[PDB]
Amino acid sequence: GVGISTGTFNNQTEFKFLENGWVEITANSSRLVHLNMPESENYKRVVVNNMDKTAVKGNMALDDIHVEIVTPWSLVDANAWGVWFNPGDWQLIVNTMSELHLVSFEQEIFNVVLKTVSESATQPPTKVYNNDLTASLMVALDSNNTMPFTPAAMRSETLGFYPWKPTIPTPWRYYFQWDRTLIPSHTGTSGTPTNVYHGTDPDDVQFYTIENSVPVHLLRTGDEFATGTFFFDCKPCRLTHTWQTNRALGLPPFLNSLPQSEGATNFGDIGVQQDKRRGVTQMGNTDYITEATIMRPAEVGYSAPYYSFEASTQGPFKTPIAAGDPRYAFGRQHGQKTTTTGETPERFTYIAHQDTGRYPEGDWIQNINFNLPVTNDNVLLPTDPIGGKTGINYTNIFNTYGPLTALNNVPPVYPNGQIWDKEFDTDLKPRLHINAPFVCQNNCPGQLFVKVAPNLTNQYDPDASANMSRIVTYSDFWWKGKLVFKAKLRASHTWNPIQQMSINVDNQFNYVPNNIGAMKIVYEKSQLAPRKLY
Amino acid sequence: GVGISTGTFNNQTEFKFLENGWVEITANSSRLVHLNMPESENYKRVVVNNMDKTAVKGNMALDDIHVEIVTPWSLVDANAWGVWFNPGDWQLIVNTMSELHLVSFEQEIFNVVLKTVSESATQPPTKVYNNDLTASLMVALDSNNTMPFTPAAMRSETLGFYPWKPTIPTPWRYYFQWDRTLIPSHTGTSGTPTNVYHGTDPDDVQFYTIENSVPVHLLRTGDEFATGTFFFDCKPCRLTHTWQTNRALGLPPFLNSLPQSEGATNFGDIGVQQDKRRGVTQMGNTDYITEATIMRPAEVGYSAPYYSFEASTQGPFKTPIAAGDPRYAFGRQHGQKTTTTGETPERFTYIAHQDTGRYPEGDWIQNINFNLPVTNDNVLLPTDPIGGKTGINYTNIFNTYGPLTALNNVPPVYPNGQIWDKEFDTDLKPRLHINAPFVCQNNCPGQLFVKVAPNLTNQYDPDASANMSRIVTYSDFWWKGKLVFKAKLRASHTWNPIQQMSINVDNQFNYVPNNIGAMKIVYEKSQLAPRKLY
Amino acid sequence: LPPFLNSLPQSEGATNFGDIGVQQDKRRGVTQMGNTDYITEATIMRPAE
Amino acid sequence: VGYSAPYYSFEASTQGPFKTPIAAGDPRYAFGRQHG
Amino acid sequence: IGGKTGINYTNIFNTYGPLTALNNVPPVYPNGQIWDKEFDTDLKPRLHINAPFVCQNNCPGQLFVKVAPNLTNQYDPDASANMSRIVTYSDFWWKGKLVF
Amino acid sequence: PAAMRSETLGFYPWKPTIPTPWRYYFQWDRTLIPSHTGTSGTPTNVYHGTDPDDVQFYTIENSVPVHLLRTGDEFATGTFFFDCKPCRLTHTWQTNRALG
Amino acid sequence: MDKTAVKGNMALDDIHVEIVTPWSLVDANAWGVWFNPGDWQLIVNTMSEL
Description:
7 chains; Capsid protein 2 (chain D)
């Protein structure tokens, strides 16, 4: 079946309007993947140590020591908005829909090709490329999710973001258990602190192998491989933002005095002594009913320790937060001006709100007796130092998460954000994930692994440390996916128009190529349109 | 039926999504109309003369002389976008739809009320208002369009634009035939030019009366009046704009030389001698194939005489144009800051494009022999004077309308634009109307006329020039309409996002009221989204 | 729709004209002359020609 | 039968000048080798 | 006109109107175009100067060809470089049928 | 249409031909003011740039399904039926001076 | 511009912008692609409308 294609190229996205403001978005995405022979046909357990870095009292956060099992397989990840939608599409989705539902997903590998490089060592010397018509491309689709979940979006290693630009899969590797101790220290810290990699705990050792836990298919040119259709089990993602804070929840105080002429200084006036007002308060002490005192239903948002690093058996790690900022570093293949030189990533900090965010500088604590103006001794301000440290206040320690905490889930981040994420297999689970807006609880699509089957030479001896020598082979194959969403059309509820993504005299050139054909994909806001929270 | 309401107030707009990217927009609009007794119960033929103004050699365009028949009836006009949609709605329609179809229209008059004012001439003196429970409000709906078509949008005299602000109908009046001569003159013109109103031509006299050609209903409080549903016969209005001009129609010339490094000065190069190129030209003379010479299918847009005033039996009038600018003057009730003082209208010049527009300064004409660089004697430029006038060039006279003229229809102008317009009853008709995007050819909704029936006093004598004296009466009544459109949802066809109406840190306050409750409705662009013309 | 006359005649007479009663540049209505604020019977916008 | 139009008239719009097209009676065809 | 020695009213002149009769473009063998797509404007040209046949609503779709990228063993998406590919080219037969 | 730049398929059955590189216009602003040999001072001639509102970057990959044909493969279009008026192969000669 | 910069060389204006695609177009829209001289004679000589 050499002279016959086994698939079709399709990179169109279709919006099929169903019944009652609900539409069905079908994002088709296909690409040409380039894959090289494994640098090593073996599984390696590799340790990464960098104490020297962390050895510098004050450089703890720069800790990279970990252990990973390097597999001879590559992973074809497409989990990132940039892989399915282009700027124009994102505008549409983001501007006219009000919520998105992730529905199904399927992939296929067609028109497989395997070539061979001959080093025609003549003069220059030359180099030749030929077709190995009988060579095979190994494919494995871990449907039962046996293998560790390794989303490539976290290291900006997904498939390209341009339909017309060949891409490639990423070398697959996963974490291996290890013990490590690193004790905090600042510039002044005396003597060498404790910084040591202890090793591996036998009881947590898990050496995974694809061969052993997943059936492998060998695809020759004539062959093709197709995944079935997976249907997710995720909650709907919203494309609306709330803005209210406890200070804007409920019936505003009745103004007994209203302005009588336009004017920035023409304010209205409640017109009632702060301690002779009616209403509800949760302060059994005072008779003071103020906008900061009046009782609200619950609390929109919470406060958490900032730049807090906790430690467990593998080392320190930043205490994650649900507030509002992700920082995305990437490049060339996923945005970053294509013609850009050097090897410095491009990046952005997607800022998302005032929906649950906090201004620490505005926080403060007072003595139960109240008694204002409050005395310095009865107030702990975000200015008074903790532990004697000049740069540490109670807020860095503070946590106001509790039974009344209201909160929203992560918004979509085009085009660098991950789309769906697998849930933790713990008995109690995170009320949300910080990395993706969609989390398949029970079932998530299985990972797809590719690998160029070993093209041996006439000389091969299993019983020899040597290192099998094989014909230089590589494979190019097309990949095609289909991600289906279900979305609801938004409606206008206010008299005033609203936030909409548009092209300006300023963005204009972030959506077109240049005289050299350089390109780039700029990030974009996703939940632009207020929604009444209460 | 005095103590019982006869209608419901509804000012909601509903979008009902049907099948296949088509939605049904139902704009409901109801309002409280205030109506006063006729200043005169009679029909008057009134002449308006202002020669003194036009008598000033050079002030011809300021000619207002006309004759009109003043009727004792008021007209309830709702034909203007501002009456049916608010800013938020217009954004939705304009941003997500790709074409609009005017479908049906119906009105109703309910909860009629008639009051009487008593001048309690005590001290101040006082004033009293009472209910005339047996008084009637006269209503007439000219279904057969017997009466002259007088759209109130042309003089900014529609119903209000705010649901919560009582409005009023406009005194109805229509043109009466008259003869008038006014001869052009400029400041220097010598002797008094000819400026005279000749009178009326018996053969064109048409004195229209509602009583005589329309059935009138008398509505007392308990009564209510409802129009049936009219279905228009109009072409679809587009919500997309084209941008191509003959210079951008077709296969661009093949560049034999392309840039090799980014750079504003790194241009591509056709790479072929202008007279040794292949292609098609409509210039049988030259061998010059240039972007301004190469042959295009037809012509996008045309050129017409500018600030041309033509004259017919009623006087001078500006020669109308289909190009791209309307100027809208209005106020208080239809936009203009509500609290604004004085009596100076608010206004704007809706600029709409580069779709068919022309830059006269760029036009020029040359001798058939061609022969360039062209000699002054073989070129008439938009600079060389015509008729000796320093400020007149051939372009002011010029007209390039013909068999190849491509062209689009008027876009919607929110909120001051008229919605539909009646077609001329001439054997040959305008390929379009400059005042509205929708033109019912055969059938247009009939005009609705209101009038407070005469509340006579005990003293009334028909046979006396006097002037019937009647009890001071006035009526308030609610009006409610329903305009239905059918629209298609737009799709993304380019890789780049597109123009979208949005709220900025700049418009923000054009969509909210002030501390005094002042309000205003700012105009907005309607066909924002390119469409491939060819 | 003819312009609304704010002043109407009060006695028969060939010279008893009505009067729009509004400054030519402070009137409301539609014009196709993006320059001026002059809305005159020769300036006001008409459907077609 | 027929009409008269401005000759060697170039009009201008947002992309530049362009010859005012005509319906009269002449097209000029430049080509080569592969098409004659 | 305008003082120009080489400009007369005719160069300005236009006598197109309600009584203008006129015919469409004739076929030009063998260099003329056959059919042309109509402008998507609300008002359209009474004719096209480039072809005698104009499909109003529907015109045949354009056919685009392109040699798929024949990569070499060395290819790196994340590099400004400029993908290097094996020099490839294609020959193929085309066959059409136009019916009048 | 490639006929406007004489870039169609060959005209001889027995002579291999080739397709043309596809390219299309992109919106741009440009001013050029008329002038004749005598015109004084440098006239206005400038390319202003691109208007964001008329930007349309088209991609085949993104808006058309692509087929990959290997030797053994073949591709066929269906039959399109035009909607055009008849073209005449007759000429009229009368002018107002010969009517009636 | 240099070309058009020559007062009197306006018609020789070529400035434009184009998007160069990596695709080629197979155009057959031209009489010469479908009929040869002999055929054109026949059509043109004996038919009255096409």
